[PDB]
Amino acid sequence: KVFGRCELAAAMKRHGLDNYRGYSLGNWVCAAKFESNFNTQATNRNTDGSTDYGILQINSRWWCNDGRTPGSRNLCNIPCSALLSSDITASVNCAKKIVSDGNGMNAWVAWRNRCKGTDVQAWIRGCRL
């Protein structure tokens, strides 16, 4: 599923991400835009052989099991395919663990390079929330 901007904002708000660990809603929408272009089915392979999955491009090296990343962890206790669903629940629940692990949203390279320090509230402007 390819979300609209305000559609995804409302879904993320109704999963508890607004100001989660101090990150306002616009931060999450901005991250999803540049990680996946709002597409739940996005996948990308990394040089080390791990793969990033879903709307927030969660990495199989640490967070989910895809059966082909030897020596990796599954800290969110889920198959990586669950992160590609049109229902964003699994992605949101796993993102909450990632952002709580000490490094905040710097875990998402696109957030650090394209959202951090910008007017992220622009990403939810005009949306009814």
Q: Which parts are annotated binding residues for substrate?
A: 101
For Na ion, the nearest residue by Cβ is: 72
d(C-alpha 103, C-alpha 124), whole Å: 24
The C-alpha angle with vertex 100 and arms to 20 and 86, in degrees rounded to 5, equals 65
* Partner from Cl ion, Na ion, none binding residue 98, C-beta < 5-8 Å depending on class: none
Nearest to 98 by CA among 118, 83, 115: 83
Exactly one of 14, 75, 121, 129 binds Cl ion (CB under 5 A); that residue is 121
Q: Of 22 and 70, which has the nearer Cβ to Na ion?
A: 70
Q: Are 48 and 61 in contact (CB under 8 A)?
A: yes
Going 123 to 78 to 40 to 59, the CA torsion angle's sign is positive
**Binding piece for Cl ion, criterion CB under 5 A, among 55-63, 70-78, 98-106, 107-115:** 98-106
Our answer to whether residue 52 is catalytic in this structure is yes
**Are 83 and 72 in contact, with CB atoms under 8 Å apart?**
no
Please give the residues from 25 up to 84 whose contact with Cl ion meets the rule CB under 5 A. Answer: 25-26
Cα dihedral 67, 40, 118, 17 sign = negative
Shorter beta-carbon distance to Na ion: residue 27 or 57: 57
Q: Using the rule CB under 5 A, which residue among 72, 82, 94, 124 binds Na ion?
A: 72
Active site residue 7: no
Where do contacts with Na ion occur on this chain (CB under 5 A)? Answer: 60, 65, 69, 72, 74
Where do contacts with Cl ion occur on this chain (CB under 5 A)? Answer: 24-26, 104, 121
Which of the residues are catalytic? 35, 52
